Amino acid sequence: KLASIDAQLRLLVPGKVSEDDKLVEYDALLLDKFLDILQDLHGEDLKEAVQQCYELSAEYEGKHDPKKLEELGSLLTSLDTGDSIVIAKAFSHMLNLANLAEELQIAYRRRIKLKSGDFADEANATTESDIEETFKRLVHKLNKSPEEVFDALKNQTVELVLTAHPTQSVRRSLLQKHGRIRNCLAQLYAITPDDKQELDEALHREIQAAFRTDETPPTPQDEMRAGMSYFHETIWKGVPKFLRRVDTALKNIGINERFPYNAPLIQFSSWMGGDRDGNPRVTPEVTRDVCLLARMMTSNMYFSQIEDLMIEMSMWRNSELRVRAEELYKHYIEFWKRIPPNQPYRVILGDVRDKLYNTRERSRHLLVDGKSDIPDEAVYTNVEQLLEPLELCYRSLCDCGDHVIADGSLLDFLRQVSTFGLSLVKLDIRQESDRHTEVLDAITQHLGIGSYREWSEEKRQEWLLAELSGKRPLIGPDLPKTEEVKDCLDTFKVLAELPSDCFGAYIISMATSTSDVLAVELLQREYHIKHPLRVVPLFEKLADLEAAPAAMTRLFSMDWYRNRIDGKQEVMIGYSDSGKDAGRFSAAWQLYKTQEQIVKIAKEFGVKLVIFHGRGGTVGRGGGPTHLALLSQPPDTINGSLRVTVQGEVIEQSFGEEHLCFRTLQRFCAATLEHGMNPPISPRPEWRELMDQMAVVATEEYRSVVFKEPRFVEYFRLATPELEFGRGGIESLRAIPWIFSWTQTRFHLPVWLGFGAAFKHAIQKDSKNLQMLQEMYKTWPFFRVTIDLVEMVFAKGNPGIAALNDKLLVSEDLRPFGESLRANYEETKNYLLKIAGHKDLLEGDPYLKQGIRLRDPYITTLNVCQAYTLKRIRDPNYHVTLRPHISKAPGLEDTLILTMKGIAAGMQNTG
């Protein structure tokens, strides 16, 4: 029955049916209910068709018989456009279901009571240290006093920077539906029979509601609002829950005070409407809009919880607040008459409410009108104005003997205010160096002094330092401006006009020089920005990384810059970007080294350095693995301040479920604290040498395939949906489409290519290297974590899918090239297994393996569907006999979009 579907699913994932392992059951239950829904909505035949795709696809994943893939192919090419959309919709939705189930399983999986203490424990959610356990290791194993631990945490800073979903920001409505499905599932395993019957019917109903929210592309403004949804869903509440647990952990190590409510321990930021790199749709107007939206939403969140705080704050008992209440003494849900003065905390909070309302309304009018007449004194323009009256309530309760009450909801609110400020996320701006060069070259030519672009690096620096202390402005009204130059100058206009608490960093993409950084500083001074954004270079190519040290050295040598920077500098690294240039192995090692070198240079100059981790690192995986990934960082690269990218495709895993949200915040904080007092071992010299030797080879293999093979590009454009995803060659292609196109094929070339040659050569040069590599794997956190990510990527790989795409889409003369990349994949995988000490992929993480494995049949169905869809899109003369319509003006591009989104939702993070 349900028993039958359960049995089916267990053939792919068998063995240890323990008591907290319910994942297969959850999946069975959801799939069962969804198959009924499909029958009701679309008819028995369609249900049977979906069931048959699933079955065929399961059998192919079980035994890997390519006849099975071909059968599923036949079935799928025969479907008319309409049936084909329903099938793609069905399997995408099954994926979202399996992901909700898996989150529930990770949320309730049992922790290991006794931990071995090896660093490997920190790779796994069930064994990793929580905040208390981290405190205790630091006190007992590293001989820190509890006070020292407390003091470091007080000064610590963790900043999570949210980026756009590369394929599909899940809309607010749907995400809530996903939440309720998950909750109904949870509650079903808590239970009276009638409750079960009712929950059962409520589950059924929510699965359907989700499926039928299934309606061209979205505005960046809307993409921003969709990306902010997780605040409401979890983070908003989660921050105070986690800070409260810090309090408890501090108490359990002998610290008899709460973690101060205004320690800036957690900060969130955003690139959404800020990053315009290679993206001219992100205009100045978009930037202004998302700043106002962030401000609107934050005030609105405070406003919509302040009435609850006012109810709870009924107390009648200090003179400081008494006085304020007396001074102060309509269209709202709760306190719509004047508050009486015998309710003093409500008089204060009543004023805070009104002010919050006015702050929210100004932003709304600024947004939809263009201006508002609402004045500064009616509104909060700075976060201290909002804290102040809340601190007053806190103190008044303490002075009147009610400390204990103060530390309830009021303390929660104080923390939310301190963490989220007036703008939930501070926005980073990002733009590429060449755009700044263009802007300056327009200025220099118009001024008649030559062409900045033609100038040497020394000349650029000399001219920029002279104009950074210039007495005249640079830009006259008659400066002629291309659209691109205007768009870049008007971005600074927007920075000059919006409050500084809207913004974080100005990241320079494709940075290579001292002058790139100075260029942006000059444009900010020219716009007279009261509080210039800090300037952060992103060095992308290997060569750029190699030139970064000399570039920072020079910046830090310049009096004007040192004085401006005030002891602090941030530098950004992008793992996926560097891996596109050099292969992932060589980018990993180079990035390790570069960070060492820049840390040393910072120290020498008495500058505190923050490394901002862009996408594609081990640290962006989420979950347990992020925890060891953080502790693997080179010594002193964190030093009390973490700034990391939370990748769009991981946001749901990290923050969709309340427990996972809590644990994400916890491991980021725990890991940051620990690393500064307990660095991973530094590598043995033999390891460096071998890693250098392996980098040279890995880069040679990767580059010879990706850049020197004259037909690589052509192979890429056929074997991969890259071109269709649009809706020079590889050097010019951006990192996201690179990773994505190969992830859609289940092949992942960008992640593993180069590791094969590195290993083969090392082991062939000297047999003893195998053992050295294995020791590196057991003992060197950096190496372990590097290998693990790639191992996780191979578990999501299926060379049979790549083969099928070759048969359908690649011309015959390219097929053997494809075949040879598949042999490289196999050989690379096997070398990685031998180094990891494993027979099977992920035998060190069987819960992850199970999760990925349950997804495969669904993903595979979408892959097969996609492959034929691309055949049809690409070739209007390919046709087959379509079956008479099975279901009860929408095209092939629509089916492909569903396919791409479904695969990406099942593939989640890779490289």
Ligand X SMILES: N[C@@H](CC(=O)O)C(=O)O
Binding site for a copy of itself (CB under 8 A): 37, 40-41, 132, 171-174, 176-177, 194, 197-198, 202, 204-206, 208-209, 212-213, 215, 244-245, 248-249, 300, 303-304, 311-312, 314-317, 330-331, 333, 336-337, 342, 361, 364, 368, 401-402, 404-405, 407-408
Residue 909's binding partner among a copy of itself, ligand X, none (Cβ under 5 to 8 angstroms by kind) is ligand X
The strand pairing partners of 187, in sequence order, are none
Q: Is the dihedral of CA 557, 559, 561, 566 positive or negative?
A: positive
CA distances from residue 243 to 58, 159, 496, 721 in whole angstroms, order as listed: 45, 15, 35, 45
The two counts, helices (H) then strands (E), for the chain are: 40, 8
Run of H or E residues at 538? strand 534-539
- Give which of 790, 786, 789, 792 is closest to 853, Cα–Cα: 792
From the number of C-beta atoms within 10 Å of its C-beta (0-12, 13-18, 19+), residue 840 rates as exposed
Active site (annotated) includes residue 621: yes
Q: Consult the annotation and say whether 909 binds a ligand.
A: yes
Q: Consult the annotation and say whether 653 binds a ligand.
A: yes
Residue 788's binding partner among a copy of itself, ligand X, none (Cβ under 5 to 8 angstroms by kind) is none
Smaller CB separation from ligand X, 625 or 797: 625
- Mutual angle of helices 409-420 and 383-399, in 10-degree steps: 160
For residue 330, the one-letter residue type is: K
Active site (annotated) includes residue 403: no
Contact in structure between 502 and 533 (CB atoms under 8 Å): no
- Give backbone dihedrals phi and psi of 260, rounded to 5 degrees, phi first: -60, 135
Residue 312's binding partner among ligand X, a copy of itself, none (Cβ under 5 to 8 angstroms by kind) is a copy of itself
Smaller CB separation from ligand X, 156 or 908: 908
Q: Which of 621, 627, 784, 901 binds ligand X (CB under 6 A)?
A: 621
Residues 862-891 that bind ligand X (CB under 6 A): none
Smaller CB separation from a copy of itself, 119 or 662: 662
Between the two ends of the chain, the Cα-to-Cα distance in Å is 40
Smaller CB separation from a copy of itself, 106 or 572: 106
- Give which of 824, 820, 816, 818 is closest to 802, Cα–Cα: 818
Q: Is the dihedral of CA 313, 314, 318, 319 positive or negative?
A: positive
Nearest distance from C-beta of residue 756 to a copy of itself, angstroms: 45
Q: 396-400 — which CB contacts under 8 Å span 24+ positions?
A: 396/318, 396/320, 396/321, 396/344, 396/345, 397/315, 397/345, 399/318, 400/315, 400/317, 400/318
Contact in structure between 884 and 836 (CB atoms under 8 Å): no
Smaller CB separation from ligand X, 664 or 861: 664
Binding string, residues 829-848; x marks residues near ligand X by CB under 6 A: -------------------x
Residue 89's binding partner among ligand X, a copy of itself, none (Cβ under 5 to 8 angstroms by kind) is none
- Given 580, 627, 663, 829, which residue is catalytic? 580
Quote the DSSP letter at residue 431.
E
User: Would you state the structure tokens that stand for residue 564, as one six-digit string?
Assistant: 């401006």
Residue 792's binding partner among ligand X, a copy of itself, none (Cβ under 5 to 8 angstroms by kind) is ligand X
Nearest distance from C-beta of residue 129 to ligand X, angstroms: 18
Residue located via tokens 């792919």: 12
Residue 316's binding partner among a copy of itself, ligand X, none (Cβ under 5 to 8 angstroms by kind) is a copy of itself
3-state SS, residue 345: helix
Nearest distance from C-beta of residue 674 to ligand X, angstroms: 21
Q: Consult the annotation and say whether 645 binds a ligand.
A: yes
Contact in structure between 642 and 157 (CB atoms under 8 Å): yes
Residue 248's binding partner among a copy of itself, ligand X, none (Cβ under 5 to 8 angstroms by kind) is a copy of itself
- Give which of 790, 804, 806 is closest to 719, Cα–Cα: 806
Smaller CB separation from a copy of itself, 409 or 693: 409
Euclidean distance between CA atoms 30 and 639, whole angstroms? 46
Q: Does the footprint of ligand X cover residue 238 (CB under 6 A)?
A: no
Residues 36-95 that bind ligand X (CB under 6 A): none
- Give which of 305, 317, 255 is closest to 412, Cα–Cα: 305
Q: Does the footprint of ligand X cover residue 614 (CB under 6 A)?
A: no
- Given 165, 295, 748, 829, which residue is catalytic? 165
Residue 801's binding partner among a copy of itself, ligand X, none (Cβ under 5 to 8 angstroms by kind) is none
Q: Does the footprint of ligand X cover residue 671 (CB under 6 A)?
A: no
Q: Does the footprint of ligand X cover residue 909 (CB under 6 A)?
A: yes
Nearest distance from C-beta of residue 621 to ligand X, angstroms: 3
Q: Does the footprint of ligand X cover residue 741 (CB under 6 A)?
A: no
Q: Consult the annotation and say whether 796 binds a ligand.
A: yes
Q: Which of 616, 617, 623, 781 binds ligand X (CB under 6 A)?
A: 623
From the number of C-beta atoms within 10 Å of its C-beta (0-12, 13-18, 19+), residue 391 rates as middle
Residue located via tokens 């979205």: 218
User: Would you state the structure tokens that stand for residue 75, as one six-digit string?
Assistant: 């079935």
Active site (annotated) includes residue 580: yes
Q: Consult the annotation and say whether 621 binds a ligand.
A: yes
User: Would you state the structure tokens that stand for residue 258, as one six-digit string?
Assistant: 């709460």
Q: Does the footprint of ligand X cover residue 617 (CB under 6 A)?
A: no
- Which amino acids are annotated as binding site for D-glucose 6-phosphate, given as ranges? 271, 430, 577, 615, 645, 734-736
Residues that bind ligand X (CB under 6 A): 621-623, 625, 653, 792, 848, 851, 908-909
Which residues sit in the known binding site? 271, 430, 577, 615, 621, 645, 653, 734-736, 796, 855, 909
Binding-site annotation, residues for L-aspartate: 621, 653, 796, 855, 909
Query: Which residues are catalytic, by number?
Result: 165, 580, 621
